[PDB]
């Protein structure tokens, strides 16, 4: 119930091959991989990249009234090499899609992508000539956030979802020994999981109340 | 005449009332009860304007702009405070009893009452009491009835009675309890009841077929097209949603079908949305059924075509000009066969010869309404060419219009028009094998076999001009009736002669041509009108070819080892057994069609063609007017597996792959240029509509309204990535709202009517130079031929008197509006509307056979002992059996044929 | 007599001087609902009219706007000269407190206008934008290149025949060849601007600061030439944040365009909403009640406090102190709690409507407003005493990128910079909109120079004035309707929609097809959180806007940037970028 991606530059972005494979997981190697995944998911360094409104809401989440620092994700490096997470928070404009592609290429694996906002998910409200309809047209996105703008705790919830995704994924421990393909778990969708608690809602508070 | 609106000087037509005088200039006055075609009755009291007789007048008077003539020197104010307050009060009074039904209403966003509620600026309700309610009647499978929404504007009764001639819709009730409908429940039996869904300003009469699978007007994707259900070619606006044809709306053509369609063309669209239709190319190996896409199917078809010595092609009068021409150029000029039989093709060639060679001007459908005396020979118009019957009714009421105009009554005072002309009306003489639906207004009805109708026509032609060939042996009573018809036709000013190929005889058309020639020789402006059977019968006759019998005998003799059947069922023009034998004998049958025909079991290859909603093309109507019908939607947008292409595109790619082993999907303009190059007499179809490079200030024309909804979610179930919208390389339209649909654009092809503040079918007022007249910048479609300088001679071959032979029964055709079209009977909504198949017998012959009505009589035609229940027809002449054409197992080719072995079983 | 009536404006003295100078047959006067004298002037006399307005006794020293228009599809052009295209120049005389709009008519083939760059130096970017979006060529322009779209772009986006939606065109497939071509097109080529790469002794080095720089506040790229540390010249490259909102105004209805107007400046919100809905109410003929004016003023001041708090925190962080931004965002969270209570959303409320607001105020908003008004001034004093009185911040800020009144006028600078240069031209006082005459609040005016520090403390005083306005609104609040009773009020009141049929009809036709504004022309200029924001709406009588023009102050500030940072350091450029209060959505729209 996993998937495998293998990357190779040498036509159409993304330059990768994905297939549906089975989890291979080893009395010590499995615990070693679990420890590596724990260390990776408990320390994420997001990239200081911003496009639009959604970046302003992301750095609103970065502040002292929500404190995403508690998850170890406040480091916010401005260099792609030092970063460990690309949060596309804003509109993927036509003139910036090469820039975003370049900044994704300068980043180093282990790398993850979080689309924030409707513009980054699908193009959003701007079905216009000068906007790429969704940032996933050329880069693989790990976690999607609906919203315009998503509230800061929605970004925090997406960060925790990315942490659960990292905690159950298989990556090569060393680049000299073993397979270099990336295994990502095909987790159950949050829509299916939350259908049990969402349909049962009966009464809400009327809008005239504060 | 010159009028003054708010100080502005306008030049108007002085013979018109003020309402459409202002509506022509683009001045907005709210109105309900007035219609451009019906007239003025002054009922709804919504069109109030403040009139001044002097240039310096303060008070004025609130007068009805639909009831006040637009004379020279009237100073009317529309946006005055008093007039605006009165119009708002009238809207409020109509809104006192109106139900809270707009979300659950089928005309939401298409409502005239909504437009005039927002137009007068009324949004506050101070009425606080109860609202009157009414029950609803079951008006049949077509019309959904909701009387609560009515405003008592009297348009339905006016149209249905004084225009359509129907008798079952009326006004009942009281002061405020006014009801509009039938005295009981039951189907509206008029053949023009479908126009009530657009005549009614409110949602009382609505389209039930549209109400089944309902979407709003802004959700519709529209296109301009031509109705395919018969030969008249009324312009329609098909609108689809979610990949299926949703609703056929009326399209304004000021020369053909201005405000009214018929029910067969309006509700007969259900065959397009059938799931049995072929959507992919399907190939057979024995009993194994596989699906291909376009390229491998084309390559395999070209291989098998190259492996045969002679490929023949059987066209159809249902398919367009370009597809038939593509088949003709694929199989060669000499190997192209028209799908009709020999008799139908002979009648069609004779009708075309009389039209484009007889020297008599055939009028358009709008021009029919002005002719004085009408003689219908043979053709049952109301069940075949119903719009011509409606125009005949208008031309009949023209006499009362003339006496009204003689008494200094303006033309829009329709109440005075029927007041002066109580029952006096123009002469109408119809001939048929039985009683028609035009018998209520006809001056005479002749119930006789086609030989006797032809002899009556020859007698009229001889008694007009003595050079015409005389028939001897007429009874003195029929001679007196002949003299009456002669006195009525000779004393007229614009006589009209209406015939067609649906009578089943050639001598009827010859007699009608002789009557028209005799009327022309006496110095009268005479017109003629032949009603064909299918939509593109006239174009197929113009192009020409062989008959179906010749194609079948080429298949049976073995000289044709490969047959391409284009959009033909082949059981409608020939016997099923002979067709099945000639198709099983042939080692390759390739059926290119959009419907699951019965011959597809014998087909070695099935090519999924496109219907009128999914294909572009040209069709030639019964008056020689070439008309272009456009595509409504791409079938592959929703179902991406669907390989469903235009038939001319299929045949042209097959021809290219047969020649040069390459697949070349062409464009419609190339095929149009090929037709107008190879065929001189089809050169007018280039001017039917402009090419795909036509732009209104650089942009294309929109197929969907500017507020089309759900672009990013209507395909999200399949994939969240919305693909590129389909590109229309063939025509000037686009499958998007990025286009021009302004009412003042320099174009003739209008997909739909919309103006800001005008959402109803009354939005067509902005698209015309004058309201009710021609379309602005000319009507679409051009005539293929002009009137000849000299005409034909006298057809001398008169027929003999009908003598009933014992044993053999002559088959009298009984055409029905719902059931005689090949594609309309496939609609599931027509199965609850069409009558049961009854064989019609004289009381004398039924008493001779001993059969009573209700019992079954079995008849054998080519080894088919088929049983039908018996209906008694008093008006049918003895020696004939009345059979409905176009039904299941009864082809229209059965007309005039004999019928042995007619026994009770 | 209402203020939205079509006023032909022959009573303006400028019309009289133009008639006496150029004769009675040189220009045409258009009657519009803009409140502006609209003068159709022949193309040959455009430079003469510009010089005449520049050399008046109380002259028009401001080029407010310069943009084209496609008139090929406008059906109702009565009283208007024949034109396929047009170019309008909106000019302001501050001392007169007046403004004029000069329109020149062009045919479809003869699309060349004399340049306006010599008279007003800020016309360069506007002429580039007009050439990019409409295809209109300006003769004598120095570098007529695209500023919104990339150089490898075919067609002009704001023309009527150009399709608007990305689903109409082919989807975005990024292949290696297209990536290489677009990456080479985005590469700075110094010979195209005459940069003179290098010198005879030592070479200049080119630096691309943006996009994605911690000091670049958005999608802004500046290409800066350095000799060591010193800046030689700057080439500010914009267009990396283009959303085509004007084409969306030609695409969406009157009611559905409100979220798009709201996202024009993502720190403005209701302040961005106000000029659009006011211009639409001018078009319809709607006079809003007092309670609507008070509610919209309150929301505008709340979002102004939010924007000024963000601007102060970003300036302090760009100087180097990373601490007060967290507390400033906590006060932003307080404002967000209040705005969530009222409008139901945090930062993009989409709450203003035609003729009113969406909902009424909920029961208890005064408690949250009291809590915020108690919370704010002590926090502001803490921020002042912690960072804004710091001598290191003063050294990094005072005297950095300073310009006089002539540079603030010739470059279109408005807001904090214009008031810091001593030009007391505030829209909330000179041309009061939305009932701003009923609120008492002072206007901060600087000493005559626009330092970074001067702009920052003027914005601090503007925040204090907005707090005063909020206090006055809270202590004195009307009790009336939240929507106008005009029939063109969109949407109608909800309860009358739910239990009346006329209101249901009006709501049904106003949300489906859109409200039908009559064929007229309207304009509304307001003081935004970052300067002066104006909406110019031409209606063809349909349910959409035939033309939507949005003038933003950050565009003029970004065009001013090379003239006020040339010769300085990169640190001075960073502080200047932090002390302009710009967002790239405002710049590129
Ligand atoms: C274990 C080791 C560490 C132990 C931790 C505790 C000690 C921490 C010490 C931190 C020292 C930080 C020093 C920062 C110096 C900055 C100097 C500077 O750049 O000043 C320039 C600035 C403007 O200069 P200006 O003359 O305006 O510009 C000329 C342009 N024409 O000039 C001005 O704005 C004028 C004022 C300059 C002030 C200079 C610094 C004063 C002393 C340091 C700050 C206080 C530290 C704590 C002291 C004890 C407190 C109990
Ligand atoms: C240091 C961790 C975040 C603190 C809180 C936010 C600090 C201010 C961010 C300002 C900013 C905005 C709004 C911004 O839009 C932007 O452009 C994308 C920046 O550059 C990366 C910015 O720096
Ligand atoms: S999704 Fe909304 S908030 Fe985010 S960048 Fe787009 S317009 Fe701005
Ligand atoms: S007929 Fe018109 S006004 Fe009446 S319920 Fe239907 S949409 Fe509403
Ligand atoms: S049912 Fe319709 S057409 Fe008839 S009177 Fe009522 S509103 Fe008019
Ligand atoms: S008269 Fe014929 S062409 Fe016209 S709508 Fe009816 S079926 Fe169609
Ligand atoms: S339109 Fe004149 S009274 Fe009805
Ligand atoms: Ca096509």
From chain A, pick out residues whose CB is under 8 angstroms from the CB of C248: 126, 128
List the CATH number of the domain containing B839. 2.40.40.20
Strand partners, B206: B144
Kindly state if the Cβ of A150 falls inside 6 Å of ligand 3: no
Alpha-carbon gap, residue B778 to B748, rounded angstroms = 6
Distance from the CA of C304 to the center of ligand 2, in angstroms? 18
Q: Which ligand is nearest to the CA of B390?
A: 6
Buried b (16+ CB within 10 A) or exposed e, B762-792: bbbbbbbebbbebbbeebbbbbbeeeeeebb
- Give the CA distances from residue B645 to residues B275, B524, B592, B655, in Å, rounded to whole numbers and listed in that order: 17, 49, 10, 15
Asked if residue C114 belongs to a domain, the reply is: yes
Give the neighbor-by-neighbor strand order of the sheet with B336-337: B288-291, B282-285, B605-608, B589-593, B562-566, B311-314, B336-337
Range of the domain at B829: 810-904
Residue A8 burial (C-beta neighbours within 10 Å; 0-12, 13-18, 19+)? exposed
CB C264 within 8 A of CB A117: no
Return the best residue to mutate from A50, A51, A54 for the ligand 3 pocket (most ligand atoms within 8 A of CB).
A54
Of the candidates B807, B570, B147, C271, the one whose C-alpha atom is nearest the C-alpha of residue C261 is C271
* Beta carbon pairs, A and B, within 8 Å: 7
- Nearest CA owner, ligand 3 atom 8: A53
Asked if residue C179 belongs to a domain, the reply is: no
Asked if residue C82 belongs to a domain, the reply is: yes
Alpha-carbon gap, residue B140 to B196, rounded angstroms = 13
Of the candidates C542, C549, C587, the one whose C-alpha atom is nearest the C-alpha of residue C70 is C549
Cβ–Cβ below 8 Å for C240 and A149: no
Nearest to C362 among A50, A94, A208 (CB): A208
CB C232 within 8 A of CB C561: no
CB A45 within 8 A of CB A71: no
Residue B693 burial (C-beta neighbours within 10 Å; 0-12, 13-18, 19+)? exposed
CB C82 within 8 A of CB C59: no
C506 and C385 part of one domain: yes
Kindly state if the Cβ of A62 falls inside 6 Å of ligand 2: yes
CB C304 within 8 A of CB C466: yes
List the CATH number of the domain containing C20. 3.30.460.80
Ligand 5: lining residues by beta carbon, under 6 Å: B 150-156, 180, 199-202, 204
C366 and C481 part of one domain: yes
> Residues 6 or more apart from C24 whose CB is under 8 A from it?
none
Tokens representing A140 are 């693989």
Asked if residue C255 belongs to a domain, the reply is: yes
Alpha-carbon gap, residue A17 to A19, rounded angstroms = 7
Alpha-carbon gap, residue C280 to C299, rounded angstroms = 19
How are the residues of chain B apportioned to helix, strand and coil, as percentages rounded to the nearest 5?
A: 30, 15, 55
C334 and C482 part of one domain: yes
Give residue for tokens 């110094």: C190
Cβ–Cβ below 8 Å for A134 and B722: no
> Residues 6 or more apart from C184 whose CB is under 8 A from it?
none
Instruction: Give how far C314 is from chain A: nearest CA, Å.
Output: 11
Nearest to C504 among B100, B721, B744 (CB): B100
Distance from the CA of B19 to the center of ligand 4, in angstroms? 24
DSSP code, position C386: I
- How distant is the alpha carbon of residue C24 from its chain centre? 35
Q: Among all residues of chain C, which has the CA nearest to that of B118?
A: C506
From chain B, pick out residues whose CB is under 8 angstroms from the CB of C253: 707
Please indicate if any CB of chain B lies within 8 Å of the CB of A124: no
Q: Which ligand is nearest to the CA of B256?
A: 6
Buried b (16+ CB within 10 A) or exposed e, B32-67: bbbbbebbbbebbbbbbbbbbeeeeeeebeebbbbb
Residue B477 burial (C-beta neighbours within 10 Å; 0-12, 13-18, 19+)? exposed
Instruction: Give how far A84 is from chain B: nearest CA, Å.
Output: 28
Nearest to B118 among C159, C500, C506 (CB): C506
- Nearest CA owner, ligand 3 atom 3: A149
Alpha-carbon gap, residue C311 to B198, rounded angstroms = 59
CB C216 within 8 A of CB C201: no
Question: DSSP 3-state assignment of B62?
Answer: strand
Range of the domain at C64: 13-139
- Nearest CA owner, ligand 4 atom 8: B102
Q: Which of C117, C139, C161 is the last residue of a domain?
A: C139
> Residues 6 or more apart from C432 whose CB is under 8 A from it?
none
Catalogue the E-assigned strands of B594-741. 605-608, 617-620, 625-629, 701-702, 733-734
The method recorded for this entry reads cryo-EM
Q: Which of C95, C118, C139 is the last residue of a domain?
A: C139
Kindly state if the Cβ of B149 falls inside 6 Å of ligand 4: yes
Q: Which ligand is nearest to the CA of B43?
A: 7
Cis peptide before B174 (omega within 30 of 0): no
Strand partners, C99: C92
Kindly state if the Cβ of A59 falls inside 6 Å of ligand 2: yes
From chain A, pick out residues whose CB is under 8 angstroms from the CB of B722: 133
Radius of gyration of chain B from its Cα atoms, rounded to whole angstroms: 28
CB count in 10 Å sphere of residue A46? 23
Distance from the CA of A117 to the center of ligand 3, in angstroms? 6
Kindly state if the Cβ of B197 falls inside 6 Å of ligand 4: no
Alpha-carbon gap, residue B63 to B65, rounded angstroms = 6
Alpha-carbon gap, residue A86 to C13, rounded angstroms = 59
Count of H helices and E strands in chain B?
23, 36
List the CATH number of the domain containing C448. 1.10.645.10
Chains contacting chain B through 3 or more C-beta pairs under 8 A:
A, C
Alpha-carbon gap, residue B652 to B325, rounded angstroms = 10
Please indicate if any CB of chain A lies within 8 Å of the CB of C249: no
Tokens representing C294 are 């008070």
Number of domains in chain C: 2
Q: Which of C139, C155, C172 is the last residue of a domain?
A: C139
Q: Among all residues of chain C, which has the CA nearest to that of A138?
A: C174
Asked if residue C7 belongs to a domain, the reply is: no
Query: Nearest 5°: phi and psi at C348?
Result: -115, 85
From chain A, pick out residues whose CB is under 8 angstroms from the CB of B712: 122, 127
C118 and C256 part of one domain: no
Alpha-carbon gap, residue B713 to A177, rounded angstroms = 47
What is the pairing mode between strands B856-860 and B902-904? antiparallel
Alpha-carbon gap, residue C460 to C480, rounded angstroms = 33
C122 and C263 part of one domain: no
In Å, what resolution does this model reach?
3.4
CB C558 within 8 A of CB C569: no
Tokens representing C478 are 């009307």
Distance from the CA of C392 to the center of ligand 1, in angstroms? 8
- Nearest CA owner, ligand 3 atom 6: A119
| Domains with residue ranges and CATH for chain A | 2-200 (3.40.50.12280)
Asked if residue C362 belongs to a domain, the reply is: yes
Alpha-carbon gap, residue A90 to A117, rounded angstroms = 7
Tokens representing C272 are 């961005």
Nearest to A128 among C171, C248, C367 (CB): C248
- How distant is the alpha carbon of residue C298 from its chain centre? 20
Of the candidates B183, B249, B167, the one whose C-alpha atom is nearest the C-alpha of residue B759 is B249
Instruction: Kindly write down the DSSP assignment for every residue of A114-171, as one continuous string.
Output: EEESHHHHH-TT--STTB-S-GGGTS--SEEE--SSPPHHHHHHHHHHHHHHHHT-B-
Asked if residue C546 belongs to a domain, the reply is: yes
CB C166 within 8 A of CB A134: no
CB C37 within 8 A of CB C101: yes
Return the best residue to mutate from A149, A152, A158 for the ligand 3 pocket (most ligand atoms within 8 A of CB).
A149
């Amino acid at each position: 119930d996993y998937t495998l991606t293998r990357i190779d530059p040498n036509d159409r972005y993304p330059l990768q091959k994905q297939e549906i494979v089975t989890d291979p997981l080893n009395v010590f190697m499995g615990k070693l991989n679990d420890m590596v995944n724990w260390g990776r998911k408990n320390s994420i360094w997001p990239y200081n990249f911003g496009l639009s409104c959604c970046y302003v809401e992301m750095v609103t989440s970065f502040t002292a009234v929500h404190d995403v620092a508690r998850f170890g994700a406040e480091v916010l490096r401005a260099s792609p090499r030092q970063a460990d997470l690309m949060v596309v928070a804003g509109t993927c404009f036509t003139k910036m899609a090469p820039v975003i592609q370049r900044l994704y290429d300068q980043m180093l694996e282990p790398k993850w992508v979080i689309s924030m906002g409707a513009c980054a998910n699908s193009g959003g409200m701007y079905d216009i000539y000068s906007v790429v309809q969704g940032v996933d047209k050329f880069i693989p996105v790990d976690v999607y956030i609906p919203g315009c703008p998503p509230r800061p705790e929605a970004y925090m919830q997406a960060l925790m979802l990315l942490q659960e995704s990292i905690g159950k994924e298989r990556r090569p421990l060393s680049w000299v020994v073993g397979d270099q393909g990336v295994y990502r778990a095909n987790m159950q969708s949050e829509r299916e999981r939350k259908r049990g608690e969402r349909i049962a809602v009966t009464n809400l508070r009327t809008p005239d109340e504060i | 005449a010159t009028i003054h609106v708010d100080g502005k000087e306008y030049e108007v037509n002085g013979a018109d009332n003020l309402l459409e005088a202002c509506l022509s200039l683009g001045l907005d006055i709210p109105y309900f009860c007035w219609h451009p075609a019906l007239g003025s009755v002054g009922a709804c009291r919504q069109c109030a304007v403040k009139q001044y007789q002097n240039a310096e007048d303060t008070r004025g008077r609130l007068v009805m702009s639909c009831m006040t003539p637009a004379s020279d020197g009237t100073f009317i104010s529309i946006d005055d405070e008093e007039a605006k307050q009165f119009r708002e009060s009238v809207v409020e009074w109509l809104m006192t009893n109106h139900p809270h039904d707009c979300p659950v209403c089928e005309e939401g966003g298409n409502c005239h009452l909504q437009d005039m509620t927002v137009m007068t600026g009324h949004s506050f309700r101070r009425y606080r009491f109860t609202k009157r309610t009414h029950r609803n009647q079951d008006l049949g499978p077509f019309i959904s009835h909701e009387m609560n929404r009515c405003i008592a504007c009297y348009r339905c009764v006016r149209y249905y009675k004084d225009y359509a001639g129907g008798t079952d819709l009326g006004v009942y009730g009281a002061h405020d309890n006014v009801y509009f409908g039938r005295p009981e429940d039951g189907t509206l039996e008029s053949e023009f009841s479908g126009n009530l869904v657009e005549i009614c300003p409110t949602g009382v009469f609505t389209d039930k077929t549209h109400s089944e699978r309902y979407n709003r007007k802004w959700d519709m994707q529209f296109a301009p097209s031509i109705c395919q259900q018969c030969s008249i070619g009324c312009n329609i606006s098909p609108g689809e949603r979610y990949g299926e044809l949703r609703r056929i709306e009326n399209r304004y053509n000021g020369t053909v079908n201005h405000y009214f369609l018929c029910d067969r063309g309006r509700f007969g669209y259900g065959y397009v949305n059938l799931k049995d239709r072929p959507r992919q190319p399907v190939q057979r190996r024995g009993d194994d059924f596989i699906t291909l896409n376009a390229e491998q199917a084309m390559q395999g078809a070209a291989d098998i075509l190259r492996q045969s010595k002679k490929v023949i092609g059987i066209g159809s009068p249902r398919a367009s000009v370009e597809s038939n021409f593509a088949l003709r150029e694929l199989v060669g000029e000499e190997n192209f066969y028209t799908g009709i039989a020999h008799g139908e093709q002979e009648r069609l060639q004779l009708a075309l010869k009389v039209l484009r060679e007889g020297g008599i001007y055939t009028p358009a459908l709008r021009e029919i309404e002005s002719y004085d005396a009408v003689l219908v020979l043979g053709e049952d118009v109301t069940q075949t060419g119903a719009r011509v019957a409606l125009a005949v009714r208008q031309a009949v009421k023209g006499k009362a219009r003339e006496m009204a105009a003689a008494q200094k009554v303006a033309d829009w005072q329709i109440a005075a028009i029927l007041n002066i002309g109580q029952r006096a009306k123009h002469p109408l003489f119809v001939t048929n094998v039985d009683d028609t639906r035009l018998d209520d207004i006809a001056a005479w009805t002749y119930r006789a076999p086609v030989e006797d109708q032809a002899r009556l026509g020859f007698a009229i032609a001889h008694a007009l001009d003595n050079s015409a060939p005389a028939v001897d042996g007429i009874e003195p009573e029929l001679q007196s009736k002949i003299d009456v018809i002669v006195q009525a036709l000779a004393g007229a000013k614009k006589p009209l002669i209406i015939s067609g190929t649906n009578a089943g005889s050639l001598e009827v058309i010859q007699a009608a041509a002789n009557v028209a020639k005799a009327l022309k020789g006496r110095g009268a402006d005479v017109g003629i009108t032949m009603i064909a059977r299918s939509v593109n019968s006239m174009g197929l006759g113009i192009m020409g070819g062989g008959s179906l019998e010749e194609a079948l005998t080429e298949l049976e003799t073995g000289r044709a080892d490969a047959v391409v059947v284009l959009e033909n069922d082949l059981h409608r023009h020939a016997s099923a057994t002979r067709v099945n034998a000639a198709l099983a004998k042939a080692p390759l049958v390739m059926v290119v069609d959009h419907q699951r025909t019965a011959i597809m079991e014998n087909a070695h290859l099935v090519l999924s063609a496109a219907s009128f909603a999914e294909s572009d093309g040209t069709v030639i109507n019964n008056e020689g007017r070439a008309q272009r019908f456009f595509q409504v939607y791409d079938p592959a947008y929703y179902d991406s597996k669907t390989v469903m292409l235009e038939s001319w595109r299929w045949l042209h790619s097959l021809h290219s792959t047969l020649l040069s082993r390459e697949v070349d999907w062409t464009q419609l303009d190339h095929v149009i240029d090929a037709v107008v190059a190879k065929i001189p007499e089809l050169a007018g179809i280039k001017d039917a509509a402009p090419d795909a490079t036509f732009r209104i200030r650089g942009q294309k024309l929109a197929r969907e309204p500017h507020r089309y909804s759900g672009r990013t979610a209507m395909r999200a179930n399949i994939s969240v990535h919305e693909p590129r919208q389909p590109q229309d390389i063939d025509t000037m339209f686009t499958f998007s709202m990025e286009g021009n649909n302004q009412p003042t654009a320099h174009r003739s092809q209008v997909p739909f009517a919309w103006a800001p503040g005008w959402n109803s079918p009354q939005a067509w007022n902005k698209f015309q130079d004058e309201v009710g007249g021609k379309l602005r910048f000319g009507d679409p479609g051009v005539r293929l031929f002009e009137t000849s300088e000299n005409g034909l001679d006298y057809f001398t071959s008169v027929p003999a008197r009908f003598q009933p032979q014992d044993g053999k029964w002559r088959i009298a055709p009984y055409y029905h509006l719902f059931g005689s079209d090949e594609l309309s009977q496939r609609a599931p909504v027509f199965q609850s509307r069409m009558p049961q198949p009854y064989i019609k017998l004289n009381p004398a012959d039924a008493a001779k056979l001993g059969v009573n009505a209700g019992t079954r009589v079995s008849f054998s035609y080519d080894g088919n002992t088929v049983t039908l229940p018996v209906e008694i027809a008093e008006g049918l002449t003895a020696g004939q059996v009345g059979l409905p054409m176009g039904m299941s197992g009864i082809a229209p080719v059965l007309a005039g044929a004999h019928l042995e072995d007619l026994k009770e079983a | 007599e209402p203020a939205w009536q079509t006023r032909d404006h022959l009573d303006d003295p400028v019309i009289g001087e133009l008639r006496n100078r150029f004769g009675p047959d040189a220009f045409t006067v258009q009657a519009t609902r803009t409140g502006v004298p609209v003068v159709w002037i022949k193309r040959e006399q455009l430079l003469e009219v510009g010089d005449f307005l520049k050399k008046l006794p109380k002259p028009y020293v401001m080029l407010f706007d310069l943009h084209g228009m496609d008139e090929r599809l406008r059906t109702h052009r009565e009283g208007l000269p024949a034109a396929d295209f047009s170019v309008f120049y909106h000019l302001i005389s501050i001392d007169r407190n007046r403004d004029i709009m000069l329109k020149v008519a062009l045919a479809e083939n003869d699309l060349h206008v004399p340049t306006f760059t010599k008279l007003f130096p800020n016309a360069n970017w506007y002429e580039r934008e007009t050439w990019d979006l409409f295809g209109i060529t300006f003769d004598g322009h120095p570098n007529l290149r695209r500023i919104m779209m990339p150089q490898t772009w075919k067609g002009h986006p704001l023309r009527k025949d150009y399709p608007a939606r990305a689903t109409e065109f082919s989807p975005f497939e990024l292949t290696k060849a297209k990536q290489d071509l677009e990456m080479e097109a985005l590469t700075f080529k110094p010979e195209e601007w005459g940069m003179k790469r290098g010198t005879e002794n030592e070479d200049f080095m080119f630096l691309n600061l943006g996009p994605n720089h911690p000091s670049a506040h958005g999608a802004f790229r500046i290409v800066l030439q350095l000799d060591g540390e010193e800046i030689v010249d700057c080439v500010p490259d914009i267009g990396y944040h283009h959303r085509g909102a004007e084409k969306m105004g030609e695409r969406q209805s009157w009611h559905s365009y409100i979220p798009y107007t709201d996202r024009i400046e993502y720190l403005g919100g209701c302040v961005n909403e106000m000029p659009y809905v006011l211009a639409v109410e001018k078009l319809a003929g709607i006079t809003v009640p007092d309670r609507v004016n008070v509610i919209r003023v309150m929301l505008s001041e709340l979002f102004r406090i939010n924007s000024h708090l963000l601007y102060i925190s970003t300036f302090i962080q760009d100087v180097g102190a990373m601490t007060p931004v967290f507390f400033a965002f906590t006060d932003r969270q307080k404002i967000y709690d209040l705005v969530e209570a009222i409008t139901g959303f945090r930062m993009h409320p989409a709450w203003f409507r035609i003729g009113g607001v969406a909902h009424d105020l909920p029961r208890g908003w005064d408690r949250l407003l009291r809590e915020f008004l108690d919370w704010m001034p002590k926090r502001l004093a803490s921020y002042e005493k912690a960072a804004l009185q710091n001598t290191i911040l003063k050294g990094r800020s005072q005297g950095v990128a300073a310009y006089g009144a002539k540079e603030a006028l010739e470059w279109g600078t408005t807001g904090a910079g214009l008031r810091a240069t001593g030009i007391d031209f505030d829209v909330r006082k000179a041309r009061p909109y939305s009932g701003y005459e009923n609120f008492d609040f002072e206007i901060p005016v600087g000493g005559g120079v626009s330092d970074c520090y001067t702009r920052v403390m003027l914005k601090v005083e503007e925040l204090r004035q907005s707090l005063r306005i909020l206090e006055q609104c809270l202590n004195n609040m009307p009790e009336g309707p939240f929507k106008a009773d005009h029939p063109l009020t969109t949407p109608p009141p909800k309860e009358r929609t739910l239990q009346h049929i006329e209101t249901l009809i009006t709501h049904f036709l106003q949300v489906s097809w859109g409200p039908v504004m009559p064929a007229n022309e309207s304009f509304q200029m307001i003081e935004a959180t970052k300067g002066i924001n104006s909406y110019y709406l031409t209606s063809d009588g349909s349910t959409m806007s035939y033309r939507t023009r949005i003038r933003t102050p950050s565009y003029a500030h970004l065009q001013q940037i090379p003239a006020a940072i040339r010769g300085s350091l990169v640190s001075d450029l960073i502080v200047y970028l932090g002390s302009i209060d710009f967002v790239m959505s405002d710049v590129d729209r």
